[PDB]
Curated annotation (Swiss-Prot), chains A, B:
The record marks 159-160 as: Cleavage. It comes from the Eukaryota. It comes from Sus scrofa (Pig). This is Interstitial collagenase. The modification Phosphothreonine is found at residue 175. The active site is at 120. Disulfide bonds join 179-367.
Length: 367, 367
């Protein structure tokens, strides 16, 4: 997070605000909620309260404009520059203007008003752009399926107005820290010569030649793929990748999900009803079998046929010796299998059934 | 169109080019075609030829970069700034760099490489930003479902290199000219207190308080709605709008198309097989009937039931006296019906069945 230079903050924490004019793109009530919801998220985590008015001045005047509207910052027409706001102060301070040449929407479609309103307000309250890719106060429009504050937006505003507003103190999603040594993973698949590490809403891409990891949203990379992946594996020859969440899985062939693919793990793979979700999975390309890890059970699956090999709910402890009782994520690189659990990973030699080395979870991260 | 100051143009019309490096987002061949297709569209309409190479320099070096890459224009990470290029000249002249922090896609999804490559190249060849909303050389990313050159991009490049490359001289879509007095319409529906005029890929919005018309893409406004609409009408009480193309129609309730709606005019409305498409349509809210215009036949349709009123393929000439043999577009405002045909429109009094005044098609356009 970054606080605006000179530290402009509203001297009282309760403010008025007023929607001077409405966009013909949305009904009045729809424009009425994009705004209060935008205001709402800054309240939930600090002591700011807000009263909407319909006459006279208010601290935060909100207008839909376009082109030159006389404030030494004219808009640019359709796209590009969407909106802007002014830091705490009298007159124009706190004011937010949105570009009417934009199609203001109520869904994922280009230029969700709610998404833009939450950005501009953090300004109106004293905040500047965050370098955090997941923060709503990042500088560019990236819509992700909802509009929620990450931990960064929260620390920025509480750094000006202190905490509160849900005295069961609020927590917001923290964007993954690549070199933070307490970092653990949800899933990991090797993917066409690179490694795709998954965590919450984020993917950490690396390996093939990267001067550092690339952090960004799962949803900016792929269409259907959920957040909170549980396992993700790859089948190279079928130029294919699979993702798992709860009892469902999506298969993807380069850039998009295969025909009618969010499907069932129980129907497609043959799992007991007790199997409410999986923990990791790896296509062992030598033997042509995928291993699914469920708590402390390793299932082997004849990929080429769907033949769950003879019974197979086995003890990981007897199958893959020395790694433990559970797995976080696993992949196969250079022939080895990299088994993850917490912050430690084990280099396993599948052929001699013995751990060769123990390394950190972050070793591939150029840290 | 706008030509770059100092008029930088490549002194020979055949150029080499080379893709120094490829994006892991797309296979090599997919990155190979976004580029040649991008180059291709500038060829089709001028005398420029291009040879792709794989070693040594070339006039147009193309690289995927990110951040500071040392040219006094560093990228900004994910979103915002997507790419940039340099005018005709030695060394860096003609060179195009694309931001790798962008998810490079092969479809409508955010940041289609083909769409961006066509923009940057017009630069490499000597062009600057057009104020034409429909031009690929407009300054902001607006993807519309394809990547085609409008008439503006064409006139700009032929203004530097003269015509040719399909000696059946190419033509490209001209963006509607609001006040050009030779302008005619495809369809027109009044829409919640404003008027939506349709033409090709574009909508011209006006009326309720507008200090001029708003020109932009049909596809930036609505999801499913085709280009080349034939008729569009509204049913206010059902807060609903309908669009027509060939033998199909979409119904829309505020911002998106109703459930499973691209449907059949013959199935839904009861039209003879001879009815391959319609010309205009208007919900006459007084009588509760919609009139469909087909060549020189007016059909009346009991909207509240789907009862095509008794036979009804009638003579427009006897139904709506004095307007003619065909209609371009029609709507109902202030009780009157505004009948369009070419560049002239007729104010009709539905109750006295007589034209009150004749005006231009552009009269509502603040021209
Ligand atoms: C898809 N478009 C974008 O992502 C543009 C990129 C851009 C930024 C600035 C600009 O001219 C200064 C031109 C283009 N970003 C914006 O509109 C941001 C403007 C801003 O920071 N408001 O406080 C608002 C977003 C973050 C909600
Ligand atoms: C969704 N994003 C956008 O529309 C941004 C908006 C923007 C522009 C400039 C900028 O910093 C200068 C920051 C943001 N446009 C761009 O990337 C254009 C850059 C350009 O003109 N290349 O020749 C390329 C498009 C037209 C294909
Ligand atoms: Ca103010
Ligand atoms: Ca804009
Ligand atoms: Ca608008
Ligand atoms: Ca897991
Ligand atoms: Ca060059
Ligand atoms: Ca960028
Ligand atoms: Ca990329
Ligand atoms: Ca028509
Ligand atoms: Zn402004
Ligand atoms: Zn901003
Ligand atoms: Zn550059
Ligand atoms: Zn440009």
């Amino acid at each position: 997070f970054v606080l605006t230079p000179g530290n402009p903050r509203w001297e009282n924490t309760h403010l008025t605000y007023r929607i001077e004019n409405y966009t013909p793109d949305l009904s009045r009530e729809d424009v009425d909620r994009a705004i209060e919801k935008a205001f709402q998220l800054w309240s939930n985590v600090s002591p700011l309260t807000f009263t909407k008015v319909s006459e006279g001045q208010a601290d935060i005047m909100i207008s839909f404009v376009r082109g030159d509207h006389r404030d030494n910052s004219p808009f640019d027409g359709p796209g590009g520059n969407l909106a802007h706001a002014f830091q705490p102060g009298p007159g124009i301070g706190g004011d937010a203007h949105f570009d009417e040449d934009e199609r203001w929407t109520k869904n994922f479609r280009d230029y969700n008003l709610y998404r833009v309103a939450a950005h501009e307000l953090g300004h109106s309250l004293g905040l500047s752009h965050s370098t955090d890719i997941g923060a709503l106060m990042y500088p560019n429009y990236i819509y992700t399926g909802d509009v929620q504050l990450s931990q960064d937006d929260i620390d920025g505003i509480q750094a000006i107005y202190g905490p509160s507003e849900n005295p069961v103190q609020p927590s917001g999603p923290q964007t993954p820290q690549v070199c933070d040594s307490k970092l653990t993973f949800d899933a990991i698949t090797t993917l066409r010569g690179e490694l795709m590490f998954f965590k919450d809403r984020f993917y950490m891409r690396t390996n093939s030649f990267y001067p550092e990891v690339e952090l960004n949203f799962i949803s900016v990379f792929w269409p259907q793929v959920p957040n909170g992946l549980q396992a993700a594996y790859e089948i190279a020859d079928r130029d294919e990748v699979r993702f798992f969440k709860g009892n469902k899985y999506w298969a993807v062939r380069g850039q998009d999900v295969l025909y009618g693919y969010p499907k069932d793990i129980h129907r497609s793979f043959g799992f007991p009803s007790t199997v409410k979700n999986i923990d990791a999975a790896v296509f062992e390309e030598d033997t042509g079998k995928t291993y699914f890890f469920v708590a402390h059970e390793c299932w082997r699956y004849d990929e080429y046929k769907q033949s769950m090999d003879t019974g197979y709910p086995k003890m990981i402890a007897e199958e893959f010796p020395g790694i433990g009782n559970k797995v976080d994520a696993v992949f196969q690189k250079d022939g080895f299998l990299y088994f993850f659990h917490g912050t430690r990973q084990y280099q396993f030699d599948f052929k001699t059934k013995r751990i060769l080395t123990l390394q950190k979870a972050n070793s591939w991260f150029n840290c």
